[PDB]
Amino acid sequence: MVMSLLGHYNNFFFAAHLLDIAMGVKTLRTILSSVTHNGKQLVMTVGLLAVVVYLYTVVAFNFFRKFYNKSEDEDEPDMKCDDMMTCYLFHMYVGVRAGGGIGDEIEDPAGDEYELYRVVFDITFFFFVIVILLAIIQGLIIDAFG
Amino acid sequence: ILEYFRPYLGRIEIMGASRRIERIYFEISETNRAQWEMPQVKESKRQFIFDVVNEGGESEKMELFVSFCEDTIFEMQIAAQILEVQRVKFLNYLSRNFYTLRFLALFLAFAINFILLFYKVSDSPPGNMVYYFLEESTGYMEPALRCLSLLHTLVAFLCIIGYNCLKVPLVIFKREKELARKLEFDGLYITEQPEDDDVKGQWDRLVLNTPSFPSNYWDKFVKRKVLDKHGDIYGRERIAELLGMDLATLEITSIDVKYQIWKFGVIFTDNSFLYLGWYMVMSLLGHYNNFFFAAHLLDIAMGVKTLRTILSSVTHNGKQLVMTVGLLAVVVYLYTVVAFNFFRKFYNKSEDEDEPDMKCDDMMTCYLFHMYVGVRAGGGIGDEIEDPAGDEYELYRVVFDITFFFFVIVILLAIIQGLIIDAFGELRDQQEQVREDMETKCFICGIGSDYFDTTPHRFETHTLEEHNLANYMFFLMYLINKDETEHTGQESYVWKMYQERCWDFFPAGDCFRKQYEDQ
Ligand SMILES: CC(C)c1c(C(=O)Nc2ccccc2)c(-c2ccccc2)c(-c2ccc(F)cc2)n1CC[C@@H](O)C[C@@H](O)CC(=O)O
Ligand SMILES: CC(C)c1c(C(=O)Nc2ccccc2)c(-c2ccccc2)c(-c2ccc(F)cc2)n1CC[C@@H](O)C[C@@H](O)CC(=O)O
Ligand SMILES: CC(C)c1c(C(=O)Nc2ccccc2)c(-c2ccccc2)c(-c2ccc(F)cc2)n1CC[C@@H](O)C[C@@H](O)CC(=O)O
Ligand SMILES: CC(C)c1c(C(=O)Nc2ccccc2)c(-c2ccccc2)c(-c2ccc(F)cc2)n1CC[C@@H](O)C[C@@H](O)CC(=O)O
Numbered sequence: 001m002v003m004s005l006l007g008h009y010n011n012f013f014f015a016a017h018l019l020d021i022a023m024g025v026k027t028l029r030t031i032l033s034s035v036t037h038n039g040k041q042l043v044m045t046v047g048l049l050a051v052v053v054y055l056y057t058v059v060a061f062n063f064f065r066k067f068y069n070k071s072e073d074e075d076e077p078d079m080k081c082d083d084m085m086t087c088y089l090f091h092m093y094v095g096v097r098a099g100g101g102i103g104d105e106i107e108d109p110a111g112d113e114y115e116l117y118r119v120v121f122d123i124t125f126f127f128f129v130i131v132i133l134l135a136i137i138q139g140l141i142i143d144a145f146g
Numbered sequence: 147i148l149e150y151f152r153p154y155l156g157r158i159e160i161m162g163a164s165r166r167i168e169r170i171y172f173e174i175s176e177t178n179r180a181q182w183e184m185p186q187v188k189e190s191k192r193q194f195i196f197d198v199v200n201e202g203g204e205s206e207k208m209e210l211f212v213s214f215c216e217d218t219i220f221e222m223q224i225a226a227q228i229l230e231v232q233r234v235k236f237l238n239y240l241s242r243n244f245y246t247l248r249f250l251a252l253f254l255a256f257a258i259n260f261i262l263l264f265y266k267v268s269d270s271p272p273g274n275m276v277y278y279f280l281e282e283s284t285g286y287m288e289p290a291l292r293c294l295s296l297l298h299t300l301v302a303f304l305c306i307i308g309y310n311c312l313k314v315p316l317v318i319f320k321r322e323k324e325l326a327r328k329l330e331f332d333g334l335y336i337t338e339q340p341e342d343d344d345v346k347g348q349w350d351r352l353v354l355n356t357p358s359f360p361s362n363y364w365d366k367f368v369k370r371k372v373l374d375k376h377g378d379i380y381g382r383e384r385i386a387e388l389l390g391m392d393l394a395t396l397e398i399t400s401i402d403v404k405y406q407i408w409k410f411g412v413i414f415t416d417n418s419f420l421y422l423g424w425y426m427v428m429s430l431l432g433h434y435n436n437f438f439f440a441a442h443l444l445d446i447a448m449g450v451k452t453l454r455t456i457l458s459s460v461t462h463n464g465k466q467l468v469m470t471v472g473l474l475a476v477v478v479y480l481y482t483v484v485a486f487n488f489f490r491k492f493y494n495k496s497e498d499e500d501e502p503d504m505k506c507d508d509m510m511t512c513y514l515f516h517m518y519v520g521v522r523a524g525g526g527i528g529d530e531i532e533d534p535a536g537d538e539y540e541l542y543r544v545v546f547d548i549t550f551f552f553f554v555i556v557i558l559l560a561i562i563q564g565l566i567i568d569a570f571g572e573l574r575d576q577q578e579q580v581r582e583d584m585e586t587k588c589f590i591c592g593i594g595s596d597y598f599d600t601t602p603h604r605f606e607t608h609t610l611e612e613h614n615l616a617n618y619m620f621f622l623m624y625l626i627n628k629d630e631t632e633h634t635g636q637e638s639y640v641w642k643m644y645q646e647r648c649w650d651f652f653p654a655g656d657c658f659r660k661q662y663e664d665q
């Protein structure tokens with residue numbers, strides 16, 4: 001009733017009532033419950049992921065600041081890791097969804113003194129974050145549904 | 147009278163020589179019941195519940211339990227122990243709150259990193275690179291960092307001191323017990339010999355000559371009885387020389403540095419002591435550079451069972467994983483060889499003319515390019531090099547790209563991921579099965595909760611009155627305290643079979659109710 005009444009002040013509120021179709025049948029209810037079936041393990045896993053990304057951010061901020069220039073125009077640089085908070089947000093927001101790791105969103109380390117360290121950094125990030133943890137997070141929900 | 151004496155009545159069931167189940171009643175002392183409730187024995191009980199079914203076999207399950215019953219007793223005894231008076235009180239207070247100190251250390255470590263998350267860098271000095279803070283409340287965080295770091299270091303030192311004062315005697319006790327038991331029952335230094343790869347026995351060999359060898363173990367006549375047992379078929383004089391005992395003494399009418407050396411050697415190989423030392427070293431290094439404190443965050447990784455299972459899933463199947471990655475490297479090397487021999491012209495990564503950047507003019511550069519860029523591409527190496535349209539070698543390039551995509555991306559990576567995922571699933575299944583079996587059957591006689599519960603709350607009564615686990619430990623201590631001449635027939639029977647390390651008196655698939663079901 002409250003949502004229906006609020007619908008008169010702004011029409012789009014009526015869209016909320018569409019959620020009534022979500023619980024209308026057994027299959028959709030099962031799909032919705034599959035998420036909350038294993039909540040505790042999911043929360044702990046995402047916390048572990050956050051901790052690992054924080055460690056990677058610490059290392060990157062200490063050693064690899066020069067490779068985080070996102071500006072294509074000279075005389076107007078856009079540093080992403082001159083602060084710990086900005087670097088951490090960049091790692092959690094762009095790196096996780098990259099699909100290939102953080103290595104395909106920063107500068108090419110070819111010809112640099114720190115080339116091998118950068119290669120190991122990229123490979124280890126790709127292996128630990130993308131391949132393993134995301135797969136476990138997805139598999140928990142899929143197995144619960146099954 | 148029954149209501150008053152209920153807490154002091156201990157009841158157990160044993161398996162008699164007459165091939166029947168018997169019930170035994172005895173007295174439980176007040177001091178024993180009071181000591182049974184200390185937190186450290188609760189932690190020991192939890193750890194025993196953890197490891198007894200995780201790796202232990204069904205055939206030895208009783209034996210481990212008996213060993214546990216011994217260790218706890220020793221712990222309780224040392225628990226009775228709690229300007230020199232001030233020092234003793236300080237040490238006792240430190241020993242009493244070890245886990246609280248650990249909690250405080252973890253809390254401080256967690257608090258440090260939140261403040262660390264506010265760092266900033268600049269080229270000019272604050273209003274070579276310069277690191278500083280950007281907190282809005284000026285001066286709020288800069289001294290708090292120093293205070294928290296000092297507190298963290300102090301707490302780490304106190305934790306090390308407490309662990310030294312609390313858990314070392316138990317380790318020494320277990321080491322001495324194992325050595326004495328093995329030496330008496332198997333004569334590993336008499337008939338057999340330790341293996342060359344077993345550094346354990348090689349280091350333990352030093353302590354046999356020590357005059358004060360059984361310092362913590364209760365049995366201070368092990369040397370006498372081992373001499374009596376093994377002195378017949380073997381020379382008595384050399385046996386006495388091996389144990390370093392005076393053969394001229396018989397029952398009738400100042401630092402001992404070797405023992406200290408052995409004790410320090412056995413102490414400095416304990417995992418917990420080394421972990422605490424590493425914790426202290428990292429905390430100390432934190433003062434030279436703040437970010438080192440971040441390492442302490444790893445303590446949260448092992449704090450709970452689920453994260454430990456996640457971590458162990460990686461190392462569960464290490465050998466196959468290593469061999470698979472080696473095979474992947476070999477295949478990529480073959481592809482690199484072919485590419486270097488035939489397809490050099492397609493590896494130009496320079497978008498500006500008159501400044502080319504060849505990637506496969508060397509074998510090493512091409513190999514690194516293939517392993518670094520090609521594997522993570524998602525679509526194979528074909529989407530990172532030049533378009534082969536219109537070239538003489540077009541079909542060969544197409545086959546190259548397709549075969550690389552099929553063999554490297556689709557198959558090998560999927561197998562590598564699936565190994566770890568399957569290991570994690572198997573570990574979870576094993577843990578769930580273990581928990582269910584523990585929660586659905588009686589620990590001692592191994593009879594399911596379906597035979598019971600035919601009457602209300604039958605399983606709970608069976609586990610709380612007839613099969614209670616602490617009653618056996620109370621019975622063992624009661625037998626220890628009592629005099630030998632006052633033992634009854636059943637008590638002497640159990641004592642005799644205990645001294646022979648035979649565990650046939652425990653019920654095995656039988657109970658009082660089942661034997662007398664027909665009354
Ligand atoms: C009869 C059923 C399939 C149905 C329709 C429908 O037929 N739409 C239909 C429409 C036109 C043509 C053909 C079909 C709509 C339905 C759905 C959309 C629009 C109109 C009716 C609903 C229904 C579900 C939740 C609501 F709040 C209201 C109605 N419901 C009722 C579901 C309810 O019975 C489930 C319950 O018995 C068991 C359970 O709780 O798990
Ligand atoms: C909030 C809760 C789920 C949680 C988190 C967390 O921060 N999740 C979360 C994740 C991301 C964002 C926000 C929140 C972490 C938690 C998990 C991972 C990383 C950091 C904290 C812990 C926790 C785990 C181990 C510890 F030693 C202490 C607490 N806990 C408590 C777990 C505890 O109940 C486990 C239980 O097994 C104890 C028992 O058996 O009695
Ligand atoms: C709980 C966890 C953080 C912990 C403690 C601790 O301080 N416990 C705690 C308990 C209550 C309150 C506060 C803290 C100690 C721990 C460390 C030193 C002394 C006592 C306990 C360790 C640990 C770490 C590395 C080691 F080599 C050995 C143990 N660990 C992690 C590893 C642990 O799993 C090893 C072993 O026990 C097997 C297992 O549990 O599955
Ligand atoms: C009690 C437990 C969940 C806990 C907390 C907590 O409650 N944090 C909490 C904090 C605030 C609010 C709510 C909850 C923290 C805990 C975690 C983070 C911060 C403070 C305390 C820890 C703990 C784990 C490892 C340490 F080194 C020290 C403490 N522990 C102890 C874990 C230990 O008992 C596990 C052991 O019994 C079995 C095993 O080894 O598998």
Ligand SMILES: CC(C)c1c(C(=O)Nc2ccccc2)c(-c2ccccc2)c(-c2ccc(F)cc2)n1CC[C@@H](O)C[C@@H](O)CC(=O)O
Pocket residue numbers: 465468469471472473475476
């Ligand atoms: C180091 C070890 C795991 C290894 C590697 C390797 O280089 N891995 C590695 C991977 C990548 C980088 C670095 C290291 C390869 C290995 C695997 C693949 C490619 C190259 C070497 C082998 C090995 C395999 C077959 C052989 F004929 C001889 C040795 N081995 C020894 C395997 C051997 O124990 C198998 C066992 O079954 C034998 C037995 O049953 O007694």
Ligand SMILES: Cn1c(=O)c2c(ncn2C)n(C)c1=O
Pocket residue numbers: 216219364626
């Ligand atoms: C202290 N103590 C024990 O702890 C013990 C024992 N016999 C067995 N145990 C376990 N004896 C004789 C003993 O004195």
Ligand SMILES: [Ca+2]
Pocket residue numbers: 631632633
């Ligand atoms: Ca008598």
